[PDB]
Design a binder for this molecule. Sequence first.
Ligand SMILES: O=C(O)C[C@@H](NC(=O)c1ncnc2[nH]ccc12)c1ccc(Br)cc1
Length: 167
Amino acid sequence: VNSFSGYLKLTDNVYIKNADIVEEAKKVKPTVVVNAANVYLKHGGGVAGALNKATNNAMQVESDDYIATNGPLKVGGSCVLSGHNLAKHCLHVVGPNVNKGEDIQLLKSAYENFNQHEVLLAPLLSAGIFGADPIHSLRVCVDTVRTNVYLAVFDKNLYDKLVSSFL
Ligand SMILES: O=C(O)C[C@@H](NC(=O)c1ncnc2[nH]ccc12)c1ccc(Br)cc1
């Protein structure tokens, strides 16, 4: 039993809710919140910009030190950093950004990072400003993630479309 409330169940292990991931994290304080990161951990906009704003830029400060030490992530890769005031940990996951020409096949690799964590709050990878089809992102998620994932879809209209078209 966990504290996630109001989600629709899609599969044995995948759940979905129309919610602002920022407000959801502040309420549940999950062990892991997933960030829709880029390889430079520059959290300027989208989910990353919103999460970082909610940490009062502490996420960005920590991320800049991470990059200075380790260099950029790989597309499809991830790193675990602090969750600041939002979660115990933030799993920064880099899905391919279609608006940069990155191979959409890397989306499965990106979701595989979720399997290293028993329970996660997460956005749809490569959705929104990353330019991929969110229906496809949900499909890859369901077919790749085996751990318990609670998906927050900010857009109500997109949420309804995702549910109504889910196979
Ligand atoms: O509309 C959607 O769900 C898709 C969209 N989501 C969010 O920007 C989002 N999601 C949840 N809480 C949030 N608070 C503030 C934004 C936000 C998205 C964009 C870029 C990438 Br890459 C991946 C997904």
